[PDB]
Amino acid sequence: SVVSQVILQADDQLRYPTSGELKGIQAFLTTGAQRIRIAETLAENEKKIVDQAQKQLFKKHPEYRAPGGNAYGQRQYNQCLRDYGWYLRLVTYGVLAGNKEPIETTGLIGVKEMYNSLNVPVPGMVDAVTVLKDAALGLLSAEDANETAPYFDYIIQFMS
Amino acid sequence: SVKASGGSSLARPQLYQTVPVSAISQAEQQDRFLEGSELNELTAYFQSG
Amino acid sequence: MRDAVTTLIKNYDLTGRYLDRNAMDELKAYFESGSARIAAAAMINANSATIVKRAAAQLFEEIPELIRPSGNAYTTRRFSACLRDMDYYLRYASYALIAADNNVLDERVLQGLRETYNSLGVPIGPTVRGIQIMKEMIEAMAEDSSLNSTDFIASPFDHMTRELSELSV
Amino acid sequence: PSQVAFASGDPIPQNVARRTPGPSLNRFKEMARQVK
Amino acid sequence: SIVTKSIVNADAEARYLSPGELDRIKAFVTGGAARLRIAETLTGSRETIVKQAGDRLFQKRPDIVSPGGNAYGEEMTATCLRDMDYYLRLVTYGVVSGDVTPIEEIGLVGVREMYRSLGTPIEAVAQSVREMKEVASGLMSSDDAAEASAYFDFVIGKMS
Amino acid sequence: MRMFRITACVPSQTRIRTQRELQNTYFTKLVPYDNWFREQQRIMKMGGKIVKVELATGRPGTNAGLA
Amino acid sequence: MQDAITAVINSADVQGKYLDGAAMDKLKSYFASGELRVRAASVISANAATIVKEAVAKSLLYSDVTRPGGNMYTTRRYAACIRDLDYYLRYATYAMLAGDASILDERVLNGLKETYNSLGVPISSTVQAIQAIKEVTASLVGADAGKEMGVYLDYICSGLS
Amino acid sequence: MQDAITAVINSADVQGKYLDGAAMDKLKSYFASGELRVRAASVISANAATIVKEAVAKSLLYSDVTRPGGNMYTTRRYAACIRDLDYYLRYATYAMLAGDASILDERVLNGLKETYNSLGVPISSTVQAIQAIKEVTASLVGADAGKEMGVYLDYICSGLS
Amino acid sequence: MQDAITAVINSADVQGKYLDGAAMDKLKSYFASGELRVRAASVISANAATIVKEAVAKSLLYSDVTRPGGNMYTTRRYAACIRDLDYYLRYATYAMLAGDASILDERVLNGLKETYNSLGVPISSTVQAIQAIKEVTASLVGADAGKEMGVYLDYICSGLS
Amino acid sequence: MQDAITAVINSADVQGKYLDGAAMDKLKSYFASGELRVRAASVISANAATIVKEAVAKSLLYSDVTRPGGNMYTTRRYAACIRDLDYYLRYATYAMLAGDASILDERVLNGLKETYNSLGVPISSTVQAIQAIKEVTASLVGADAGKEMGVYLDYICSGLS
Amino acid sequence: MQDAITAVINSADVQGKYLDGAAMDKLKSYFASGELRVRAASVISANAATIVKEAVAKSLLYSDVTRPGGNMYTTRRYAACIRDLDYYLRYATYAMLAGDASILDERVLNGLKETYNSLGVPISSTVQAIQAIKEVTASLVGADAGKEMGVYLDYICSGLS
Amino acid sequence: MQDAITAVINSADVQGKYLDGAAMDKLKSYFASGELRVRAASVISANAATIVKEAVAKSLLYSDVTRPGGNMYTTRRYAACIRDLDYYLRYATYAMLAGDASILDERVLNGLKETYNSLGVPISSTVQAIQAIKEVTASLVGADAGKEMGVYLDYICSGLS
Ligand SMILES: *[C@@H](C)[C@H]1/C(=C/c2[nH]c(/C=C3N=C(/C=C4\NC(=O)C(CC)=C4C)C(C)=C\3CCC(=O)O)c(CCC(=O)O)c2C)NC(=O)[C@@H]1C
Ligand SMILES: *[C@@H](C)[C@H]1/C(=C/c2[nH]c(/C=C3N=C(/C=C4\NC(=O)C(CC)=C4C)C(C)=C\3CCC(=O)O)c(CCC(=O)O)c2C)NC(=O)[C@@H]1C
Ligand SMILES: *[C@@H](C)[C@H]1/C(=C/c2[nH]c(/C=C3N=C(/C=C4\NC(=O)C(CC)=C4C)C(C)=C\3CCC(=O)O)c(CCC(=O)O)c2C)NC(=O)[C@@H]1C
Ligand SMILES: *[C@H](C)[C@H]1/C(=C/c2[nH]c(/C=C3N=C(/C=C4\NC(=O)C(CC)=C4C)C(C)=C\3CCC(=O)O)c(CCC(=O)O)c2C)NC(=O)[C@@H]1C
Ligand SMILES: *[C@H](C)[C@H]1/C(=C/c2[nH]c(/C=C3N=C(/C=C4\NC(=O)C(CC)=C4C)C(C)=C\3CCC(=O)O)c(CCC(=O)O)c2C)NC(=O)[C@@H]1C
Ligand SMILES: *[C@H](C)[C@H]1/C(=C/c2[nH]c(/C=C3N=C(/C=C4\NC(=O)C(CC)=C4C)C(C)=C\3CCC(=O)O)c(CCC(=O)O)c2C)NC(=O)[C@@H]1C
Ligand SMILES: *[C@H](C)[C@H]1/C(=C/c2[nH]c(/C=C3N=C(/C=C4\NC(=O)C(CC)=C4C)C(C)=C\3CCC(=O)O)c(CCC(=O)O)c2C)NC(=O)[C@@H]1C
Ligand SMILES: *[C@H](C)[C@H]1/C(=C/c2[nH]c(/C=C3N=C(/C=C4\NC(=O)C(CC)=C4C)C(C)=C\3CCC(=O)O)c(CCC(=O)O)c2C)NC(=O)[C@@H]1C
Ligand SMILES: *[C@H](C)[C@H]1/C(=C/c2[nH]c(/C=C3N=C(/C=C4\NC(=O)C(CC)=C4C)C(C)=C\3CCC(=O)O)c(CCC(=O)O)c2C)NC(=O)[C@@H]1C
Ligand SMILES: *[C@H](C)[C@H]1/C(=C/c2[nH]c(/C=C3N=C(/C=C4\NC(=O)C(CC)=C4C)C(C)=C\3CCC(=O)O)c(CCC(=O)O)c2C)NC(=O)[C@@H]1C
């Protein structure tokens, strides 16, 4: 969280957290309520969001389900949907934490070679993340969606 | 513009490698004459050249 | 580095002056435009990689020889190096737009570019041309977006062009 | 013995193609074609 | 500046600005109005603040102004007041910037060595800054006093 | 000069991001007393674990004749 | 480290599920206590040196340890003890601000116990000094945050022992 | 400066000795090579501007160096580049005639890299142009005279690099 | 660094075409000379200390360079000169086996002039020493490989000049 | 020196293309500001000496700088300081007209720092004098023109920093 | 380290004896199998990523370790594990080319077991991954090369155990 | 570095002559002055901070440098100035002990002028400060040792100029 980032910076400088860092921590503590609200809304509306995202992505990419793709088996299609669920869970974790650290340490660092080892196309997965973010933004309110969007955008950045 | 220059000295990044370049680079880095290993590399590659 | 607030603070500290009315006005202007700066930064963060790809996919048609033999993007290695440089430019433009100051643009981009690019034989004209193409794409995207203020976006790319370009006249 | 004469021998001259206009001057090439 | 710190943290990882750092930047820009109100109060009250703090210091620690003290004499007293003015100006810079980096860079790096060279009691200087904090916090609302107290306390800690 | 024989494991936190060759993170080495504090701080801040420490050199509680 | 806020996320990721009411209540409690934690952290940062000096005076000064033949007799060892106490105070402050003692477990109880045993540091004297730190900081910050900080200080003492 | 004769004479002088057998041998070798050197110098003098012309044509024409924004774009910049190549050709010819590379250091290389660094000029591109100059000279000069001219041009390239 | 193979391929690619008519001529010549050059390199590597011994005996020993006040006076400077002679022989071998002196440029001539001028090494004495090294190697390896190594030795000598 | 117009044309020509709409936008903005720029320039030109008189009276006169032992003490040094203030005002006018500080970088801030360092010129005193010049000019020319001139005056000051 | 030839030489040397018939025929066998070892190593290096990919697919894909809670769940942990498997494959290839297994203990088995214990890595799952690598490499290279590779792979697994 | 003894030894060695009476007289003079040098070194080491403090107060304080816009304005920059003076005093004491200004030339002056020219540090003002240090040290140590220290202080000043 932002608390972790501030305390890590203070430890690195061998000093206590500064005034600006303390005020940022205070602001994050204040906005924790909307962070929580992000949490319940995403958690309880994942299923429609994930279904719409998967259908849109596979319509745009008629290869993985098609011959010569990656998700022939139901075990593979369920795996792609599981990856959506895990990504959106990580996004909720990161929004609740306030920064990108949970996403970074759970499903961001090394994910490119993660899916190279499995032959899942990184551009395909980044397109999937784009459609998932679009679905989440459409399903969330305007200010709520604006707050949630940067984390999905950063995930897209790190993916490609 | 910038108010100081470090000095634009030439740079020679290796575009790709060849066997003689690899052997000579190993010898040069290790501060040695081309020992039996590099010499055999060079000999075999020259024969198959 | 130094954002606009830091550079104004340094300027007034130089003469040992308290923050006067003009200083307060400039600070207020930056603080009011901070919302638009953050919005543009969010937009460019969302569309960074695609913008750079489009910039290259127009720049190499403007200068076809940069992908032909003896051009400095010929290999896939060279092509990825060119893309990395353009992504560097976009990232530092984002940083400069949020900072409202080109000091970061000078400290971490321009202070050795001609040295490095001449050492590697990399042209310094197509580089700025691609930077300006990136700026045009960014401006068009921001204008399409609901950004009330977007004039500040042209500042970092223009400073890049001015500092990294050759003094033709 | 004389087979080692790589550098000391007469150098093998190479061929350097004279530089020519490229696709960056396609507009001018088409202008020349129509000015034909 | 908080903008400086966030941009530097982003560049140290080579990524674009993270959502958390953008949140911090937005909070800083929103609070900029209160920052300027506090800073303008400080600059308008610079004469009164410095005068009252100097009077309090010269009363609490008469040793520094007594003969044989560093501040003894008209010129030495004027220079002590000028240093108080310098630190008040640095406090204003930190208030405007939302952090203590300008105070650190201008008047808190090597201050111990400089005052050792000049023969000044660093604890006395810290006491002067603390009195400046009290006088200034007496001239503003509760929240603004707490806001300026962070910069004042940072100077106190760096001096003692 | 006092020596701290320290056994510790300090896994890297950036290998998969920097593409650097793997190294034997575990080590049981002797550290000088003066550098021991900074080394412990660095190991703990790198996420490492200090399995063991011993005073290999230098009588405990000695006041003079350190180095 | 491992924040109190990130603790619930880490647990939810370990069980492969989402934050629920049973942990979201703890999250809300942390959010409510955040302002008090930040206030205590600011106070402790302001009064870092004074707290250490007061605890040193109240616990170790004018004792067998500070007298000749004690482990805190020489000037270098006294300075080392002061530095250690300052680090204890700063890391207790970090634990207070983060709502957990995970950073104390990681960056404090990593090799400190065996290092002290090798150096012959008095464990009981260290515990007494930490108790003095806890009492002084509780007095300076208030009972409400004093108890919360003393929880992490007790964690440090128990880890040392 | 110093030709080969001057170099041998200076070595003998600094040692305070008469021209011994080895000095006579070196002088005889230079005298053996002299007529070919004169022939190559006359050829290059006849074809001075041409050689630079085809050198730039094989190297820098229709390129990023001569595009707008490059360092050779403007007419004045192109003239400056041509002037640099003219100096390089003339001084390589002088060095070939003298049998020594000391003239290059005395005149060209003593500050030229700092000059191009302050000018922003691309050392890689100028080295490419000089390298092309090597073959353009070799074609008109022959094989062994070409080797000598290439040696002096390689000295120029090493000085610039 | 680079070799003849990479130089040929670089020329071919920059021209944009395959290895048509003369790239393969140079490549076949290089491969033909490869075995003899490898044997010469092995002989030089075996005789490295010896070759330096006869070279120093011929050129530097019993001279003002070795006498007091000379740059090869003290034991450390003698060892440094011998190590430099080994450097010259090694990089001559590298250039011979790679078919190009670009290794000499990047690794030998990059800062040779700077280091030698800053230190005070006699350029003429070093050139004479390298000439003696070349002659000894040519005698010990044959006129053919002697000349083949001597081209790179003379490149180093010209760079020194 | 580069004004706004030459700056736009330079940015265009290093791209090789004609002035598009944005270039004309910048040019129209500069021409719009041109009338205010010219009015300020004419007023400053008429009130050249008076502004320097007021600035010297405000900052340097009756100070240690102008008393004995100060660098503005001797009559020749007083005249030199006045001429320097005239330089600052005139080049500020040039930068105002051109919409850029390129002339300041080329001529005013070109070696100025170590020039004053070698001569012994008090940097802080000259910066305060330039600030007084800026204040007087702003008072005499108007809020907007005063701020616009003060931008270049502050550029000179920060460069002197 | 050592190889087959080095090991037989050391075995003779410990008794200080010349190469007897047993050493002779062991060297004969190693020389005969060297071509097979080179072929298998070349194949493994050419397809190196595929072996690790298939081994993980048939070993830990859709598995408990990949499940959250295990040591294989996160993307970072998965990348670390695949890197470990790739290095184990490379060291097995080094051992097979060498003909001697001492290299594994030299570079790998020094502290991997205890470091995995410290990190809480499942040694049983590690051994299973090693075994799956065994079948993948055996299938890809051939039974003759498969057994030879599996000898060192089993050495690695036993050392980790 | 070099003291008087090593200086005379090297002077004899470079020409290869043994130590004669004329050389030995210099070492006798150095041995005569050694006691005074050691006394002065002890005094200066005792009063290192005080000397720099007094020199700074007597030369730099309340001048243009310390005021805003000067090169001694920020606290860090003041501390750097104090550190530079500390270097000058300490290395002057080293040179006075060694009786030779070689450590000053090779560890205090070789590039210091370039560093000040880059940083904008006023060389004339730093020379004035070193003169103040010279006067203070002369008053503190006596006419003879004061003059000897001032010799090397003037050496540093001349090197800076
Ligand atoms: C008197 C004119 C000066 C002065 C002295 C002073 N000292 C203390 C307290 C302590 N002094 C020490 C120092 C040491 N103890 C050691 O074992 C050694 C190792 C060589 C040293 C140097 C210590 C540790 C203390 C604390 C008490 C203790 O030892 O337990 C005081 C009282 C401090 C107080 O307020 O308690 C005083 C007055 N102080 C001055 O101002 C004079 C310069
Ligand atoms: C008895 C001393 C042994 C011996 C001597 C010997 N030396 C040489 C040649 C040289 N000796 C030196 C040594 C030094 N020069 C220095 O400046 C220093 C430090 C003062 C030393 C140690 C040198 C440099 C030479 C090279 C010749 C020259 O001076 O120019 C020889 C001749 C070797 C030859 O073949 O030329 C000899 C015979 N020989 C023995 O067998 C004794 C054990
Ligand atoms: C005979 C060789 C001449 C001679 C030599 C001499 N050289 C040095 C010192 C150095 N020589 C080098 C050169 C190189 N080092 C490298 O790595 C390379 C490429 C591989 C080169 C060309 C260097 C770097 C030094 C200094 C550092 C070092 O120790 O290597 C000396 C010593 C000079 C001194 O007084 O310190 C000498 C004497 N001396 C002669 O008289 C011959 C003409
Ligand atoms: C599609 C079936 C075929 C194809 C078409 C194609 N290529 C590009 C663009 C590029 N192709 C390359 C090629 C190479 N890079 C290398 O290093 C080498 C040797 C290994 C080659 C052959 C590169 C560098 C590019 C990008 C630059 C460029 O324009 O050349 C395109 C254009 C894509 C776009 O417009 O964005 C197309 C349509 N390439 C194939 O390999 C297929 C046989
Ligand atoms: C007053 C609260 C204390 C005090 C003050 C005092 N200061 C001086 C002299 C100087 N003080 C400074 C400090 C600064 N200059 C800067 O530019 C800044 C950074 C922004 C600082 C902090 C300096 C440089 C001086 C030197 C004089 C000069 O301006 O050139 C004195 C006089 C010392 C003397 O005798 O010369 C005094 C008295 N004294 C106290 O006792 C108070 C604790
Ligand atoms: C994967 C095959 C199995 C697994 C392992 C696992 N290992 C780590 C972490 C590390 N592994 C190493 C590897 C080496 N250390 C050495 O000295 C060498 C010898 C050549 C090797 C190969 C290292 C160094 C680390 C630490 C990190 C670093 O690289 O610096 C982990 C990470 C655990 C974590 O969560 O942090 C894992 C999971 N675990 C399994 O379940 C697989 C069967
Ligand atoms: C003070 C309350 C007690 C005390 C202290 C004391 N400590 C040392 C020496 C060291 N202390 C540490 C401790 C740490 N290093 C870390 O990284 C952490 C995290 C904050 C801690 C707590 C270390 C590593 C040392 C070694 C010194 C070094 O620089 O590495 C001493 C000196 C011991 C000696 O001189 O032999 C002392 C005296 N002493 C007491 O009596 C108190 C109970
Ligand atoms: C046309 C009216 C006449 C003509 C033209 C001609 N020019 C070239 C080649 C070049 N022309 C230039 C000129 C400029 N480059 C600049 O940047 C500027 C200012 C913007 C000028 C004036 C240059 C530099 C070249 C070199 C080619 C290159 O850039 O690569 C040619 C062809 C030369 C060749 O060898 O191919 C021609 C034919 N020729 C006529 O007869 C007309 C009267
Ligand atoms: C009196 C006979 C005439 C006169 C005098 C007058 N002068 C000033 C102000 C200044 N005069 C000087 C001159 C010098 N300074 C020097 O160091 C030397 C050379 C050694 C000279 C000649 C200076 C520098 C000033 C500036 C003020 C200052 O000293 O700080 C004034 C006051 C002007 C004002 O308005 O401030 C006057 C009146 N005036 C006459 O009418 C007499 C003919
Ligand atoms: C769906 C959007 C895309 C896709 C999916 C796909 N994934 C796999 C296999 C795996 N995916 C994961 C996922 C993760 N690993 C992590 O560390 C995290 C971050 C916390 C996640 C989300 C893993 C672990 C695997 C392998 C192990 C397992 O499945 O348990 C496959 C299988 C491919 C194959 O079997 O060959 C597929 C198909 N495929 C697409 O085309 C989409 C773009």
Provide DSSP, J34-101: HHHHHHHHHHHHHTHHHHHHHHHHHHTTTSTTTSTTSTT-SHHHHHHHHHHHHHHHHHHHHHHHHTSS
Ligand positioned closest to the Cα atom of G71 = 7
Give all strands of the β-sheet with F26-32 in edge-to-edge order: F26-32, F3-9, F49-57
**Cα(G66) to centroid of ligand 7, in Å?**
14
- Looking only at the bridges linking them, the beta strands covering F3-9 and F26-32 are antiparallel
In the block, tokens 């600052």 appear at J88
Exposure string for E12-31, b = 16+ CB within 10 A, e = fewer: eeebbbbbbbbbbbbbbbeb
Ligand that lies nearest to the alpha carbon of residue K77, given by its number in the listed order: 6
**DSSP state string for G79-113:** HHHHHHHHHHHHHHHHHHHHTSSHHHHHHTSSSHH
The answer to whether J3 and J99 are in contact (CB under 8 A) is yes
Return the structure tokens found at E154: 């940072």
- Pairing between strand F49-57 and F26-32? unpaired
Pocket test for ligand 6, best of K93, K113, K118, K119 (most atoms within 8 A of CB): K119
The Cα C30–Cα L156 span in angstroms is 49
Q: Which domains does chain J have, with CATH numbers?
A: 1-161 (1.10.490.20)
Structure tokens at F4: 């701290």
Nearest residue in chain A measured CA to CA from E147 = A19
Picking from L97, L86, L10, L3, the residue whose alpha carbon sits closest to that of residue L48 is: L86
Experimental method, per PDB record: cryo-EM
3-state secondary structure of K9: helix
Residue by residue, DSSP assigns F3-62 as EEEEEEE---SSHHHHTPPP---EEEEEEEHHHHHHHHHHHHHTT-EEEEEEEEES-TT-
For ligand 6, is residue F12 a contact (CB within 6 Å)?
yes
In angstroms, rounded to a whole number, what is the distance separating the alpha carbons of residues J152 and J147?
9
DSSP state for residue G74 in the 8-state scheme: S
Q: Which residues of chain L make contact with I64, given a CB cutoff of 8 A?
A: none
When CB atoms are compared, the residue of F16, F22, F49 closest to K118 is: F49
Q: Which residues of K touch F26 (CB under 8 A)?
A: 111, 114-115, 118
Supply the DSSP symbol for B4: -
CA-CA distance, H51 to H136, in Å (whole number)?
A: 6
Contacts 24+ apart (CB under 8 A), A139-148: A139/A41, A139/A45, A139/A48, A139/A49, A140/A38, A140/A41, A140/A42, A144/A34, A144/A37, A144/A38, A144/A41, A147/A34, A147/A38, A147/A95, A148/A38, A148/A42, A148/A91, A148/A95
- Cβ contacts of A154 on chain E, cutoff 8 Å: 15-16, 18-19
L14 vs L11: CA distance, rounded Å: 6
**Phi, psi at residue F50, to the nearest 5°?**
-95, 100
Q: Among residues I62, I39, I127, which one has the least CA distance to residue I88?
A: I127
3-state secondary structure of E81: helix
CA pair distance F26, F36, nearest whole angstrom: 17
* Structure tokens, E6: 């966030």
Q: What is the sign of the dihedral through the CA atoms of C14, E26, C26 and E140? A: negative
Is the minimum CB–CB distance between C11 and chain E shorter than 8 Å?
Answer: no
Measure the CA–CA gap between E74 and E77, rounded to whole angstroms.
5
Provide the 10 A C-beta neighbour count for residue L103. 19
Indicate yes or no: CB of C45 within 8 angstroms of CB of A149: no
For residue L7, the surrounding DSSP H or E stretch is helix L4-15
> Cα-atom radius of gyration of chain I, to the nearest Å?
18
Q: Does H107 touch chain B (CB under 8 A)?
A: no
Distance (Å) of CA J71 to CA C87, J60, J120: 52, 11, 7
Using a CB-CB distance cutoff of 8 angstroms, which residues of chain A are in contact with residue C87?
Answer: none
Our answer on whether the CB atom of I93 is closer than 6 Å to any ligand 3 atom is no
Instruction: Answer yes or no: are the C-beta atoms of F26 and K111 closer than 8 Å.
Output: yes
Instruction: Report yes or no: C142 and C153 within 8 Å, Cβ to Cβ.
Output: yes
Q: Please indicate if any CB of chain A lies within 8 Å of the CB of K79.
A: yes
- Residue-wise over E46-60: b if at least 16 C-beta within 10 A, else e? beebbebbbebbbee
**Cβ pair L78:E110 closer than 8 A:** yes
Contacts with L156 (C-beta within 8 Å, 6 or more apart), sequence order: L88, L91, L92, L104, L108, L109, L130
How many other C-beta atoms lie within 10 A of the C-beta of residue I65?
Answer: 25
J56 contact partners, CB below 8 Å, separation of at least 6: J81, J82, J85, J129, J132
Identity of residue G78: Y
Which pairing describes strands F3-9 and F49-57: parallel, antiparallel, or unpaired? antiparallel
3-class state of residue K68 by DSSP: strand
Residues 6 or more apart from J149 whose CB is under 8 A from it? J40, J44, J92, J93, J96, J134, J137, J138, J141
List the one residue out of E93, E138, G107, C103 whose CA is nearest residue A19.
E93
Beta-carbon contacts below 8 Å between H and I: 29
Q: Is position H157 annotated in a ligand binding site?
A: no
Angle, CA D33 vertex, CA D29 and CA D34 arms, to 5° = 120
CB of E114 less than 8 A from some CB of L: yes
Contact list in B for residue C122 (CB cut-off 8 A) is: none
What whole-number distance in Å separates Cα of residue A29 and Cα of residue E114?
Answer: 40
Q: Which residues pair with F3 in a beta bridge?
A: F32, F57
Distance CA G126, CA G161 (A): 10
Q: Show the CA angle centred on residue I118, arms to residues I116 and I119, nearest 5°.
A: 65
Cβ atoms of C109 and I55 within 8 Å: the answer is no
Q: How many CB pairs under 8 A join J and L?
A: 38
How many other β-carbons are positioned within 10 Å of the β-carbon of residue A6? 23
Task: Specify the length of chain G in residues.
Answer: 161
Q: Inspect the interface and report whether the beta carbons of G15 and K69 lie closer than 8 Å.
A: yes
Please indicate whether, in this complex, the C-beta atoms of A11 and G19 are within 8 angstroms of each other: no
Q: Which atom of ligand 10 is the closest one to the Cα of K60? A: 27
Touching I (3+ Cβ pairs <8 A), the chains are: B, C, D, H, L
Ligand 10 centroid–CA J99 distance in Å is: 58
Whether E31 and E105 have beta carbons less than 8 Å apart is answered as no
The pair phi, psi for residue L146, each rounded to 5°, is -60, -45
DSSP reduced 3-state for J160: helix
Q: Which ligand is nearest to the CA of K54?
A: 10
Strand partners, F5: F30, F54
Q: Which of I1, I10, I97 sits opposite B34 (nearest CB)?
A: I97
With beta carbons less than 8 A apart as the criterion, state whether F52 and F4 touch: no
Quote the CA–CA distance of C20 and H48 in Å, as a whole number: 67
The tokens describing H113, both together, are 């890299």
Whose Cα sits closest to atom 24 in ligand 7? F37
Closest atom of ligand 6 to CA, residue K60:
43
DSSP string for C128-143: HHHHHHHHHHHHHHHH
What are the angstrom distances between the C-alpha of C127 and each of C105, C134, C164, C169, H56? 15, 11, 9, 19, 23
What's the sign of the alpha-carbon dihedral E108, E112, E116, E122? Answer: positive
Does chain I reach chain D with at least 3 CB pairs under 8 Å? yes
User: Residue type for L95, please?
Assistant: A
| Pocket-testing residue among G63, G78, G125, ligand 1, by greatest number of atoms within 8 A of Cβ | G78
- Residues found in chain D: 36
Closest D-chain CA to C71: D22
Distance CA B6, CA L71 (A): 24
Q: How far separated are the first and last CA of chain K, in Å rounded?
A: 22
Q: How far apart are CA C91 and CA C109, in angstroms?
A: 10
Q: Which residues of E touch C2 (CB under 8 A)?
A: 1, 4
Tokens of H150: 């290439």
Beta strands per DSSP E along A15-120 = none
> Nearest-CA neighbor of J78 among J116, J111, J51, J70?
J70
Q: Which residues of F touch K84 (CB under 8 A)?
A: 22
Q: Whose CA is nearest to atom 29 of ligand 7?
A: F37
SS (H, E, C) K106-136: HHHCCCHHHHHHHCCCCHHHHHHHHHHHHHH
Taking Cα atoms as reference points, which of C18, D34, E93 lies closest to residue L68? C18
Distance from CA of K98 to the nearest CA of A (A): 29
Sign of the C-alpha dihedral computed for residues E137, E139, E141 and E144 taken in this order: negative
Distance CA I97, CA B43 (A): 10
Which residue's C-alpha comes closest to atom 10 of ligand 9?
Answer: J61
How many cross-chain Cβ pairs, F to G, lie less than 8 Å apart?
39
Cα–Cα distance, A100 to J95 (Å, whole number): 47
Distance, in Å, from the CA atom of C140 to the CA atom of C43, rounded to the nearest integer, reads 12
Which 3-state string (H, E, C) describes chain I? CCCHHHHHHHHHHHHCCCCCCCHHHHHHHHHHHHHHHHHHHHHHHHCHHHHHHHHHHHHCCCCCCCCCCCCCCCHHHHHHHHHHHHHHHHHHHHHHHHCCCHHHHHHHCCCHHHHHHHHCCCHHHHHHHHHHHHHHHHHHHCHHHHHHHHHHHHHHHHHHC
Chain B contact present for H116, CB below 8 A: yes
The Cα–Cα gap between E68 and J124 comes to 31
